[PDB]
């Protein structure tokens, strides 16, 4: 049960899609809960769940819709380990696709450095890339980057 976020402008948000072995498909607003979104952000390493948005917030999928309902308890590391309750078809349409916004929205990269480890710090906000400022740039931040 492999998750994926598609359609979002910022790094850790978009439509929720789960692969059942070899096929990608969307999920309903009703089937997805807060516990499942907690696992999805954790599995994808996107932090913690900030919002759950329904009604095709990031667009409508084009494909198959999974009818099963996840029953995560919130502490699982992957969606594969989550117990799943099967449901019949016909529950939703594609205008009721679910979306998730997780917390790690920051976009940072290192440029103009030959070694990928060293370079100039750059940050993306409001759709553009820019350079940071020297003030309040200590070694604690550089350790985390």
């Amino acid at each position: 049960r492999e998750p994926r976020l598609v359609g979002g402008d910022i790094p850790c948000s978009g439509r929720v899609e789960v692969k059942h072995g070899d096929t990608w498909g969307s999920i309903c607003d009703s089937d997805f809960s807060l516990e499942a979104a907690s696992v999805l952000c954790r599995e994808l390493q996107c932090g913690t769940v900030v919002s759950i948005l329904g009604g095709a917030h990031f667009g409508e999928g084009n494909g198959q819709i999974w009818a099963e309902e996840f029953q995560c308890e919130g502490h699982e590391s992957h969606l594969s380990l989550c117990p799943v309750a099967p449901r019949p078809e016909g529950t939703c349409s594609h205008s009721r696709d679910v979306g998730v916004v997780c917390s790690r929205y920051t976009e940072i990269r290192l440029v103009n450095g030959k070694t990928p480890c060293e370079g100039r710090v750059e940050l993306k906000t409001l759709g553009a890339w820019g350079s940071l400022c020297n003030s309040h740039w200590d070694i604690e931040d550089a350790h985390v980057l």
Binding site: D29, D31, L34, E35, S51, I52, G54, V101
Partner: protein, 121 residues
């Protein structure tokens, strides 16, 4: 940051939307009870849902008095996380936040048991 005297025209005045709303109803005073908390829109479970609960919701929304309090998702299924379960409103509280219930916690309820109300227009 800079401190300056400003005309009242430049100041920002903001009105925010209501926390509680009713959805999927032909009448503006009828529909599914949804509440907003913690970044998500959520619903209420029909366990211990009665007319005393519906009175508080119809009063908070600013509609007329409540007359029916549906259950088992008559008006449609909801979205997002279920926020409240086993609501025990006494009928006179000013908001659903005053009444005691399971608050912002894990509810065994499903999305087919969403509570609904119908208020006078």
């Amino acid at each position: 940051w800079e401190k300056r005297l400003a005309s009242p025209s430049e100041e920002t005045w903001i009105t925010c939307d209501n926390k509680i709303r009713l959805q999927e109803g032909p009448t503006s005073c009828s529909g599914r009870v949804e509440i907003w908390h913690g970044g998500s829109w959520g619903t209420v479970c029909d366990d211990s849902w009665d007319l005393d609960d519906a009175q508080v919701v119809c009063q908070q929304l600013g509609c007329g008095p409540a007359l029916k309090a549906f259950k088992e998702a008559e008006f449609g299924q909801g979205t997002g996380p279920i926020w409240l379960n086993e609501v025990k409103c006494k009928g006179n509280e000013s908001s659903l936040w005053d009444c005691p219930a399971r608050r912002w916690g894990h509810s065994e309820c499903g999305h087919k048991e969403d509570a609904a109300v119908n208020c006078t227009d």
